[PDB]
Amino acid sequence: VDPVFSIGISSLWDELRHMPAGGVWWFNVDRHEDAISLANQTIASQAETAHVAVISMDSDPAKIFQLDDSQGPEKIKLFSMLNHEKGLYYLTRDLQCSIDPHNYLFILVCANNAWQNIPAERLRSWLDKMNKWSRLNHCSLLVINPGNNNDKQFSLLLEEYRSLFGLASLRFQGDQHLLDIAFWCNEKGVSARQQLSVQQQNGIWTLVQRSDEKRILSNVAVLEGAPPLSEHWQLFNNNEVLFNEARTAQAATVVFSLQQNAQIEPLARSIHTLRRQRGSAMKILVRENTASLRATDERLLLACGANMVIPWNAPLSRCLTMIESVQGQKFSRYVPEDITTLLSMTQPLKLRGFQKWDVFCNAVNNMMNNPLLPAHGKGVLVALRPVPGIRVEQALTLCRPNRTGDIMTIGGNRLVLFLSFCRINDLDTALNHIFPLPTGDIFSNRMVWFEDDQISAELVQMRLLAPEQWGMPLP
């Protein structure tokens, strides 16, 4: 009786694609443009006779939403709601005023970070009421949400899996998108926790479809003047020949050596190629001999396909035990095909020294909104209050950042610094590197923000500072 609808993903299995006429489905997206594209394709994939409506926060849906000429419904009805939570609260009655909702598909494309301010309890109540209304009217609702940080909200959605008939996510990974289907319920059954890869070609979302295990291939420098432990050890002078011989290997163990910082970039490429051509059976280890690494470079090597990076603090015996640790293990993580999108994450700010208030806030906000950066680990935002007897300009005189991604600003008797990729524990060392005199004889108090939400809130409270309260270095 009640028809089944289809999600806007090409070449998707019937178990994960259909949408019977009763229920609510939720979809998360990383960027607003991707949400709009998915909404347009979902409109385009439907049958000619089906009933479809689109509700968008953005004004003039006639300008941002389109139809397919070849197939799709003859007409779709657009709705616009003001930027108020009361719009979502009244949605059901407001639609009842204008449509009879029997077998009607509602695509709700919210604005960017639209669901960020909705409280947890009211979101739960909204989901429950929408499920009840959908089952009563035999209508289906698809919710498409372009957001940035929804971990708590995603946990809420997972806990409310009874109200939802399906939860999926689309994450941007440079050249391909990752479709994470938490669960999907249809007339063909229930599916649980699939991870799939989807790519956009011409604006269309299409799904992208024992012998030497004990062998150990290692650089000579890994064994600090030590005999080969077993028959299974081959010793190589540099990582180049090691890469060439590992190309042929299948499930062998490869141990690179990091002596110099300049090797990090080519090592990354080597690991990438070795993890692409050769599958998850191979085990890639990077033994760091001299202190020639940052946390960011280690994250890059881990993303490029290294099992783990062994620090230089660990002596040889611990490194050998760690080599024993990775045995029998497969590399389940995803390595993006594009290599430049990984190296671009090494330094995303590219601004040094003093910045005015507005440029500082814009730069830090832009870095915070970057999807291709570690969560809660993008940097540390610090506000320093100078002791009485010295001004913020004098504190700016005694402040010389050394890295590229470190920026400063002065305003409202505060010196506000941002240090990129620095962790909260290693903050005082950084401050000692920056200031000539000890931090403690120059500043009275320290406020620190290092989580994404905290930094965003501090930035939104830092734009409220009216001008003429900002500061510049004295010429």
């Binding site: 004004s59 003039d60 006639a62 009805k77 657009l78 616009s80 003001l82 009361k86 407001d94 005023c97």
Partner: protein
């Protein structure tokens, strides 16, 4: 007199019962007619 009053009562009792059973229908039709969209305003059927 009393007899016709009882007849009218009898008429009205299931009449009001059927009217209550269709509460949802009545609300839906009244919402269609009155048409007070407070926050969600249809921008328009697009081709």
């Amino acid at each position: 007199i009393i007899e016709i009053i009882v007849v009218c009562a009898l008429i009205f009792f299931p009449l009001g019962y059927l009217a209550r059973h269709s509460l949802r229908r009545i609300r839906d039709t009244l919402r269609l007619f009155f048409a007070k969209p407070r926050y969600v305003k249809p921008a328009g059927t697009l081709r």
